[PDB]
């Protein structure tokens, strides 16, 4: 494989780490290639859930559990880390919760949460790479809890970083708050595309295309899909009780990614730089509740 940039794997991985039989499992976790019997069934499905009250409480409680733990991952992000250290503090920060960490096991995603740094645009492996002055890293975070998964990740800076990086994590952010706030009742999912593709572009950006914005409640991927990227032909309108992510991913360069050998991590072709954040939403009668939502600041990570 010719890798696209400066980072490798750093192999091998610590020894998967153990879930206590306490804490409930989704259907993949014990399946023997991490596929998901619940999720296949509504695959190619394009029909919307509406939430029920009680499915509410739900995905307001994975979701502001999923919050917390991305917060203990905030809070260890500099230089000499490992991203495995990390994802040790998560895994057990989502036990802690009485949670599953959801990224484990899926489709045999061998972590508790995927770390993407630099070139990475999502889905990152968490591994024996400590991080480097410079850097940037997301986090994404996903935790299942009595029946609901929980969805979100920001872009961290590793000590000081360059005016480039500065720029793509803010642009980034600008471009997810952007099409949240064109999120309420009525608007096609299609739409958002158009609004973060105009923002990303008018900066230099492009945006990934083969990575979606998804439905999640009991199932972690499920209708709608909803790409970042300008004239798509996403299928369905917006309505009260609906649930979903936005995870636009922006790049210094091309939009084109590829798979590494271990077959999750992403990677941009050109080798420059990705970020990504993304929240799951809540669509209301007057708009959308940001159900991963920072509760004790105003402001994402990298702003501090
Ligand atoms: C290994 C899968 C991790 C997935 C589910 C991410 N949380 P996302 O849905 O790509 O944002
Ligand atoms: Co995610
Ligand atoms: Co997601
Ligand atoms: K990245």
């Given at each position: ?8 794997p ?5 020894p998967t780490r ?8 989704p259907?993949?976790?014990?399946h ?7 999720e296949?069934?509504?695959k190619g499905t394009?029909?919307?859930k509406?939430?029920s009250?009680?499915?509410?409480e739900?995905?307001?409680?994975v979701?502001?559990l999923?919050?917390?733990v ?7 992000i500099?230089?000499?880390v490992?991203?495995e250290?990390?994802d ?6 989502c036990?802690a919760?009485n ?7 899926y489709?045999?995603?061998?972590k508790?949460?995927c ?10 492996i ?5 991080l480097?002055e ?6 994404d975070?996903?935790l299942?809890?009595?029946?609901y998964?929980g ?7 590793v000590?000081?970083v360059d ?7 803010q642009?980034?952010?600008?471009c997810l708050m ?5 999120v ?5 999912y299609?739409?958002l595309?158009?609004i973060?593709q105009?923002?990303?572009q008018?900066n230099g ?5 083969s990575?979606?914005?998804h439905?999640?409640h009991?199932?972690?991927h499920?209708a709608?899909n ?8 996403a299928?369905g ?6 649930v ?6 922006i790049?210094?360069g091309?939009?084109?990614?590829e ?6 991590t992403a ?5 420059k730089r ?5 929240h799951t939403?809540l ?5 959308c509740?940001?159900?991963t939502?920072?509760?004790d ?8």
């Amino acid at each position: 494989y010719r890798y696209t940039g400066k980072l490798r794997p750093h192999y091998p991985l610590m020894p998967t780490r153990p879930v206590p039989s306490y804490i409930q499992r989704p259907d993949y976790a014990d399946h023997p290639l991490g596929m998901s019997e619940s999720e296949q069934a509504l695959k190619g499905t394009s029909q919307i859930k509406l939430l029920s009250s009680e499915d509410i409480e739900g995905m307001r409680l994975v979701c502001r559990l999923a919050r917390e733990v991305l917060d203990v991952a905030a809070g260890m992000i500099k230089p000499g880390v490992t991203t495995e250290e990390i994802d040790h503090a998560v895994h057990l920060a989502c036990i802690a919760r009485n949670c599953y960490p959801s990224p484990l096991n899926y489709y045999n995603f061998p972590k508790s949460c995927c770390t993407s740094v630099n070139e990475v645009i999502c889905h990152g492996i968490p591994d024996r790479r400590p991080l480097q002055e410079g850097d940037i890293v997301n986090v994404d975070i996903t935790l299942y809890r009595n029946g609901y998964h929980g969805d979100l990740n920001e872009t961290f800076f590793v000590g000081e970083v360059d005016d480039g990086a500065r720029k793509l994590v803010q642009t980034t952010y600008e471009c997810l708050m952007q099409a949240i706030d064109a999120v309420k009742p009525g608007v096609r999912y299609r739409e958002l595309g158009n609004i973060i593709q105009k923002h990303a572009q008018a900066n230099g950006f492009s945006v990934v295309r083969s990575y979606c914005g998804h439905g999640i409640h009991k199932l972690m991927h499920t209708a709608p899909n909803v790409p970042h990227y300008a004239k798509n032909k996403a299928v369905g309108v917006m309505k009260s009780g609906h649930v979903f992510t936005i995870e636009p991913m922006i790049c210094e360069g091309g939009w084109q990614d590829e798979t590494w050998p271990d077959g999750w991590t992403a990677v941009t072709r050109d080798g420059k730089r990705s970020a990504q954040f993304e929240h799951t939403l809540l669509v209301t009668d007057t708009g959308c509740e940001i159900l991963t939502r920072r509760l004790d600041s105003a402001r994402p990570h990298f702003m501090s």
